[PDB]
């Protein structure tokens, strides 16, 4: 499982989005191309035709609209699906380190991918309102479970286990809530109190995602569910 983070979605790039994408790539290490330098003449076609032979399975695209709104498109190579998230609030890794009293610099931990922890997403039916649960949430779970390599607790070295990626859903299984996606990154510190204490340190970035819209293919296909626009039958 390989993933790449690209800014080709935006017409032009700035310092803030560049730092955000650098942080996202750092999160995606070691299964990502760090030296990927985006150029203005490049396009989604060129990047997917690079993903093809490179065996990349997942692609994050950071786009910026003329209004300044930022969108994160999580696509699965090489034929979709596509998930449109909207940026509500974001913080840089530099800002997180500055705010933290004891920031920790990335090190040998770059060799190990983070473990995915997923909270408040409703897989089983609680109200038979299948349209949000049985259409969107299971796809979210599968999409991230495939974004990160499958984790076998019975073979994973605990000393290699060093990073965690939190996806917390502000939403209840009764389809009541703010439908907010919380993306965060934490570093594991194991302290001997065998009884071991696990302390999690913010690494960033903090991401506030609005689950806006979906596509079957790579930036193509019928709208399967759009929050604001429901198409008649």
């Amino acid at each position: 499982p390989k993933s790449m983070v690209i800014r080709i979605g935006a017409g032009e790039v700035g310092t803030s989005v560049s730092q955000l994408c650098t942080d996202v790539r750092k999160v995606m290490e070691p299964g990502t191309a760090s030296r990927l330098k985006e150029r203005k003449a490049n396009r989604l076609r060129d990047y997917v035709t690079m993903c093809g032979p490179l065996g990349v399975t997942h692609l994050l695209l950071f786009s910026r609209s003329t209004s300044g709104n930022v969108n994160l498109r999580l696509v699965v190579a090489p034929r979709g699906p596509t998930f449109h998230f909207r940026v509500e609030k974001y913080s840089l890794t530099k800002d997180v380190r500055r705010a933290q009293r004891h920031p920790k610099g990335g090190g040998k931990e770059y060799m190990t991918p983070p473990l995915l922890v997923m909270n408040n997403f409703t897989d089983p039916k609680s109200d038979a309102h299948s349209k949000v649960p049985r259409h969107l949430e299971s796809l979210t779970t599968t999409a991230f479970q495939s974004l990160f390599p499958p984790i076998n607790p019975q073979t994973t070295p605990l000393k290699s286990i060093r990073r965690v990626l939190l996806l917390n859903r502000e939403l209840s299984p009764e389809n009541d809530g703010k439908f907010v996606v919380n993306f965060r990154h934490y570093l594991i510190t194991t302290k001997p109190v065998e009884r071991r204490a696990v302390k999690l340190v913010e690494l960033g970035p903090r991401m506030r995602l609005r689950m806006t819209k979906v596509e079957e293919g790579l930036c193509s296909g019928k709208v399967l569910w759009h929050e604001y626009v429901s198409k008649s039958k």
Partner: peptide, 23 residues
């Protein structure tokens, strides 16, 4: 029928995304 043309169509698209994203 047509209404469940669209209904089942959304259905296999969602499931398509599911197994294809699984791999």
């Amino acid at each position: 029928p047509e209404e469940k043309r669209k209904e089942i169509e959304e259905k296999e698209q969602w499931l398509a995304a599911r197994r294809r994203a699984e791999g």
